[PDB]
Design a protein around this ligand. Structure first.
Ligand SMILES: NCC[C@H](O)C(=O)N[C@@H]1C[C@H](N)[C@@H](O[C@H]2O[C@H](CN)CC[C@H]2N)[C@H](O)[C@H]1O[C@H]1O[C@H](CO)[C@@H](O)[C@H](N)[C@H]1O
Ligand SMILES: NCC[C@H](O)C(=O)N[C@@H]1C[C@H](N)[C@@H](O[C@H]2O[C@H](CN)CC[C@H]2N)[C@H](O)[C@H]1O[C@H]1O[C@H](CO)[C@@H](O)[C@H](N)[C@H]1O
Ligand SMILES: [Mg+2]
Ligand SMILES: [Mg+2]
Ligand SMILES: [Mg+2]
Ligand SMILES: [Mg+2]
Ligand SMILES: [Mg+2]
Ligand SMILES: [Mg+2]
Ligand SMILES: [Mg+2]
Ligand SMILES: [Mg+2]
Ligand SMILES: [Mg+2]
Ligand SMILES: [Mg+2]
Ligand SMILES: [Mg+2]
Ligand SMILES: [Mg+2]
Ligand SMILES: [Mg+2]
Ligand SMILES: [Mg+2]
Ligand SMILES: [Mg+2]
Ligand SMILES: [Mg+2]
Ligand SMILES: [Mg+2]
Ligand SMILES: [Mg+2]
Ligand SMILES: [Mg+2]
Ligand SMILES: [Mg+2]
Ligand SMILES: [Mg+2]
Ligand SMILES: [Mg+2]
Ligand SMILES: [Mg+2]
Ligand SMILES: [Mg+2]
Ligand SMILES: [Mg+2]
Ligand SMILES: [Mg+2]
Ligand SMILES: [Mg+2]
Ligand SMILES: [Mg+2]
Ligand SMILES: [Mg+2]
Ligand SMILES: [Mg+2]
Ligand SMILES: [Mg+2]
Ligand SMILES: [Mg+2]
Ligand SMILES: [Mg+2]
Ligand SMILES: [Mg+2]
Ligand SMILES: [Mg+2]
Ligand SMILES: [Mg+2]
Ligand SMILES: [Mg+2]
Ligand SMILES: [Mg+2]
Ligand SMILES: [Mg+2]
Ligand SMILES: [Mg+2]
Ligand SMILES: [Mg+2]
Ligand SMILES: [Mg+2]
Ligand SMILES: [Mg+2]
Ligand SMILES: [Mg+2]
Ligand SMILES: [Mg+2]
Ligand SMILES: [Mg+2]
Ligand SMILES: [Mg+2]
Ligand SMILES: [Mg+2]
Ligand SMILES: [Mg+2]
Ligand SMILES: [Mg+2]
Ligand SMILES: [Mg+2]
Ligand SMILES: [Mg+2]
Ligand SMILES: [Mg+2]
Ligand SMILES: [Mg+2]
Ligand SMILES: [Mg+2]
Ligand SMILES: [Mg+2]
Ligand SMILES: [Mg+2]
Ligand SMILES: [Mg+2]
Ligand SMILES: [Mg+2]
Ligand SMILES: [Mg+2]
Ligand SMILES: [Mg+2]
Ligand SMILES: [Mg+2]
Lengths: 46, 271, 93
RNA sequence: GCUCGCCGGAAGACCAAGGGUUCCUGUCCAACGUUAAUCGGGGCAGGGUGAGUCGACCCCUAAGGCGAGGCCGAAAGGCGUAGUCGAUGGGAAACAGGUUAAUAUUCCUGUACUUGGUGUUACUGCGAAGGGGGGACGGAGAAGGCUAUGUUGGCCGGGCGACGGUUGUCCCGGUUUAAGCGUGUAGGCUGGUUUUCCAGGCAAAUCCGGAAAAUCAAGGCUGAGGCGUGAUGACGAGGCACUACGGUGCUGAAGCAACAAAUGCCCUGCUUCCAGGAAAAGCCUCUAAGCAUCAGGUAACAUCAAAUCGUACCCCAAACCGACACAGGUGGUCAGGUAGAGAAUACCAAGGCGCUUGAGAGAACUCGGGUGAAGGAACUAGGCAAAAUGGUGCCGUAACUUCGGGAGAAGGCACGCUGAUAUGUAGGUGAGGUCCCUCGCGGAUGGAGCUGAAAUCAGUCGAAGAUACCAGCUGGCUGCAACUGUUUAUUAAAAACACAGCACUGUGCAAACACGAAAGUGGACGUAUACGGUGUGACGCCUGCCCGGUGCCGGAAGGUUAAUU
RNA sequence: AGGACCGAACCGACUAAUGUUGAAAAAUUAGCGGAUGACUUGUGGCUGGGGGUGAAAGGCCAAUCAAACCGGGAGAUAGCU
């Protein structure tokens, strides 16, 4: 039974990483929202 | 020749192949080769804009000479070669100065034949001349529409254009479609038809043979749902509609051409 | 030429363990905790200048710090660099 | 610790992905572990990952992304040129032995190789953002030559057996050695050398392409394996002694041949086919500007340098994805013996395990199996399930057919072991020896030794010889779909979809059409023997009548008719 | 030669039984189909919600699909319980 989550660090970083978020104007809005909320982890980068 | 395959399997029973013993059996001329990757019918937005395209064999692009601009220099047909990118075969030709090129092989062309281009060239197959210098009533191919742009008409296997008339700066041509068109008399054309007229006599015989050529299956609109096609729906086999394309335009007889820019060059439509 | 200030910052301490003792007693290799950003050239220069011994070769590894628990809270110890410095058969550091 | 059982193309070993300290040692047993726990992948503390050569980084690019200017768009933004990123692909170099509780192609020992910088010698036309070559490429099939590997023999060390025999044609074990360096073989490809000239290669070119002669008839490129050296070495049985009995010090004999043999190598080869099978750099070469008694290039030598990051451990799994120590899922590499076609199957090797509650009893009933008198589908919606068939060789085989099929039709016969033919045959391999030569990794003769079917005859045992595992049930009529394929992940695999074929239809290329406020893009680097839409659905014989309705196509006189005025 | 035949790996999923607070939110066991191709698989990429993709089942688009999920309009509205 293959499950929906198949980890891959390269794909993780390329889809949800810090630079991926900063590439677009809506990702920077995601980053601003998380900074305003006070998240201890901004992105999946680490 | 045209060969029928013996029915040793259901996929071989109905296969008819066109086999040319005179086609080159080695690799193509490397300097004249380019890469062309597949698209799947998808444009720069990533969407499918043409349907039923995808897969097939990997192919290299052979840079074929459609302009035929080396005027006055004779060339000898080094050989004939298979081109995966067109229904016609190509001919590798060598010029007297040591330049090799690819042209469309016309009917009757063979290794060792001599070809030339320009106003002073002889009226024989494979020779390129302005249609102002080609006699009227001649059968030409690879016809230019704009002087210097390169041949665009009658480029498929077995196709040709007939020079019907000539009126000042223009020549009327009968096209394979049955259309009469006006083209500047200064446009170029090659003499003779395009070889490989047996290309239309081949039968693929199986679905995999169509898949080898990059064609994907065609689902009929009647077999879809109303949300998928205007033809979809029904409890059983129902149609009750005027046939239409997947986007709602009538598809049996309704005319779609609209070009007032080039309407002036159409002497008569194909019918 | 690496400066003396850099050489003085490079080396952090000696490493004391059974493996380090065996290395010293069998191959003339001293094991040192060095700075994380210390290179083999910097370690060689620092050891020669400050320990007044001749060095044959330097091998380095980065040791990653362990995840530990203190009162049911989770912390991590820092990574550190370990250098195996081989001396020239008569130095006795 | 000794027995027993299980896996052994795995339930063994090594990795990538993913995880992240789960690794090793000491210590503890609260909680966790479906039970106890002294044990643990649990708690705590300490330790452990060593590289010029392995990988990343790095140079080069694919799909694709981003993209100075630019084009487009209410704004946000979209697209895209020059560029720049982007592996899953191309690009230099290390092997064997030893070693830790835990790392090793990284440490040690021995023996190597690569790239670059400097300095000294000599010889010298060097030079790119340009030219050429090369890198560089498919499927299938066939065979030869090899090797990894195995088997047997020889050799060496040990043994003489708890119960009849075992000094022998007896038993057990071992019989191993790398890269590198030298040679250049089976095989594959290609005619060499010189001269003259030239509308081609964004200009030049001595380079590539082309034209014309002369001359030599063997030159060159590639290439597994073998051989020598590496190696007077390392390893090596067991022995001579220790052990804190987990493990250690010293010695060390033989260390060969024949046969069989890969799916690995020659082989990016060869043959053939059509569906016609990446790119760029590294690399070789040619020059331009330029420099030109300098730079730069080539060879030799000496010296320096090769940074940084990963490296523990699990990795078909108790450590990854599944909430679990979960009968699920998960890419690559290795591939022993007997039997076997086999990577199936049975039993074993090396190696690893007995699956974290047990002990009893021996009710109904449930689950998974074995056997069954007489009957034999009478069961049931239905032969569901089960039972049955099953291998090889040979004989034999119907309607129908699109001539291929149907067909493994159906049906039947033989099958173990022993001896002989022949103390091992036909065939395969093939030493020494002999002889010759364009003397070598050579040719001819020869057959020793090894290996070794299948057949016939005779005998022989059992109820049974394809003895286990493994391994088609067969035939007749009929509907549907021509066929192989696809489909409702998780109640429907079908007669549904697709399909080759057929027809109608649009489209003359700035194509129709589709995605896009647009720019652009696909169609297509295609051009009517092409492309799009629609319907039908191999093939055979065919496809009748109706244009009144609805649509489409053509017409353009007349009637009506918008903005406009 | 072949969308050829028999049959492992590999891909699938026709039958039955078990299980159905399961070992498992789709499996196990015994049989079953394809197995050189319209095959299968790793790595990376692209297509985005009235949108995609679909050999077409309204199938699939993160255990969710006749219009995904997340946040907001929002305390929608509810002659109904
Ligand atoms: N010092 C030790 C003993 C000594 O060497 C010895 O006994 N040699 C015999 C010789 C005796 N002649 C051999 O017979 C065989 O070939 C004979 C043919 N020469 C025929 C019979 C056959 N059994 C016997 O096989 C052979 O056995 C030995 O060597 C064998 C070779 O590998 C090994 O397999 C075996 N393990 C080993 O005992
Ligand atoms: N493998 C067994 C499978 C099975 O038993 C089988 O199909 N058997 C066929 C039967 C089929 N009916 C037989 O025709 C033969 O007699 C026919 C009698 N009229 C005529 C044609 C002739 N070929 C066929 O010779 C025979 O082929 C078999 O035996 C051959 C010869 O040893 C083998 O080459 C072949 N590998 C093998 O299949
Ligand atoms: Mg998370
Ligand atoms: Mg189409
Ligand atoms: Mg069709
Ligand atoms: Mg259709
Ligand atoms: Mg459609
Ligand atoms: Mg339907
Ligand atoms: Mg509709
Ligand atoms: Mg009906
Ligand atoms: Mg070292
Ligand atoms: Mg390191
Ligand atoms: Mg024991
Ligand atoms: Mg821990
Ligand atoms: Mg442990
Ligand atoms: Mg407990
Ligand atoms: Mg622990
Ligand atoms: Mg800009
Ligand atoms: Mg862009
Ligand atoms: Mg780019
Ligand atoms: Mg780059
Ligand atoms: Mg890579
Ligand atoms: Mg280990
Ligand atoms: Mg061998
Ligand atoms: Mg194979
Ligand atoms: Mg390891
Ligand atoms: Mg358990
Ligand atoms: Mg498990
Ligand atoms: Mg698997
Ligand atoms: Mg097995
Ligand atoms: Mg248990
Ligand atoms: Mg019982
Ligand atoms: Mg019972
Ligand atoms: Mg009972
Ligand atoms: Mg029972
Ligand atoms: Mg029973
Ligand atoms: Mg029974
Ligand atoms: Mg009975
Ligand atoms: Mg009976
Ligand atoms: Mg009966
Ligand atoms: Mg009955
Ligand atoms: Mg009854
Ligand atoms: Mg049954
Ligand atoms: Mg009926
Ligand atoms: Mg069917
Ligand atoms: Mg039919
Ligand atoms: Mg029919
Ligand atoms: Mg499926
Ligand atoms: Mg279903
Ligand atoms: Mg367009
Ligand atoms: Mg047409
Ligand atoms: Mg269509
Ligand atoms: Mg139909
Ligand atoms: Mg009709
Ligand atoms: Mg097949
Ligand atoms: Mg079949
Ligand atoms: Mg099969
Ligand atoms: Mg089903
Ligand atoms: Mg099964
Ligand atoms: Mg429906
Ligand atoms: Mg789902
Ligand atoms: Mg809606
Ligand atoms: Mg409101
Ligand atoms: Mg409410």
């Amino acid at each position: 039974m293959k499950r929906t989550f198949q980890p891959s660090v390269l794909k993780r970083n390329r889809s949800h990483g810090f630079r991926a978020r900063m590439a677009t104007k809506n990702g920077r809005q995601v980053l601003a929202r998380r900074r305003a909320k006070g998240r201890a982890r901004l992105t999946v980068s680490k | 020749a045209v060969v029928k395959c013996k029915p040793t399997s259901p996929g071989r029973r109905h296969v008819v192949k066109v086999v040319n013993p005179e086609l080159h059996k080695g690799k193509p001329f490397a300097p004249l080769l380019e890469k062309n990757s597949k698209s799947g019918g998808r444009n720069n937005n990533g969407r499918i804009t043409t349907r039923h395209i995808g897969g097939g064999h990997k192919q290299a692009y052979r840079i074929v000479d459609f302009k035929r601009n080396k005027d006055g220099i004779p060339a000898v047909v080094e050989r004939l070669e298979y081109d995966p990118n067109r229904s016609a075969n190509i001919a590798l030709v060598l010029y007297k100065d040591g330049e090799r090129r690819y042209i469309l092989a016309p009917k009757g062309l063979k290794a060792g034949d001599q070809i030339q281009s320009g106003v002073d060239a002889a009226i024989k197959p494979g020779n390129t001349l302005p249609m102002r210098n080609i006699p009227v009533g001649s059968t030409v191919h690879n016809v230019e529409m704009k002087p210097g742009k390169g041949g665009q008409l009658a480029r498929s296997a077995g196709t040709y254009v007939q020079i019907v008339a000539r009126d000042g700066a223009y020549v009327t041509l009968r096209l394979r479609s049955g259309e009469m068109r006006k083209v500047e008399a200064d446009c170029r054309a090659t003499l003779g038809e395009v070889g490989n007229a047996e290309h239309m006599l081949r039968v693929l015989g199986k679905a995999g043979a169509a898949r080898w050529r990059g064609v994907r299956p065609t689902v009929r609109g009647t077999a879809m749902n109303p949300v998928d096609h205007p033809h979809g729906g029904g409890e059983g086999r129902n149609f009750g509609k005027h046939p239409v394309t997947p986007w709602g335009v009538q598809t049996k007889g309704k005319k779609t051409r609209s070009n007032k820019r080039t309407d002036k060059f159409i002497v008569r439509r194909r019918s | 030429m690496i400066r003396e200030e850099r050489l003085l910052k490079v080396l952090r301490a000696p490493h004391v363990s059974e493996k380090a003792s065996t290395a010293m007693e069998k191959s003339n290799t001293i094991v040192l905790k060095v700075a994380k950003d210390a290179t083999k050239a910097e370690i060689k220069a620092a050891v020669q200048k400050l320990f007044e011994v001749e060095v044959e070769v330097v091998n380095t590894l980065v040791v990653k710090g362990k995840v530990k628990r203190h009162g049911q809270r989770i912390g991590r110890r820092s990574d550190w660099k370990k250098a195996y410095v081989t001396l020239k058969e008569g130095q006795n550091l």
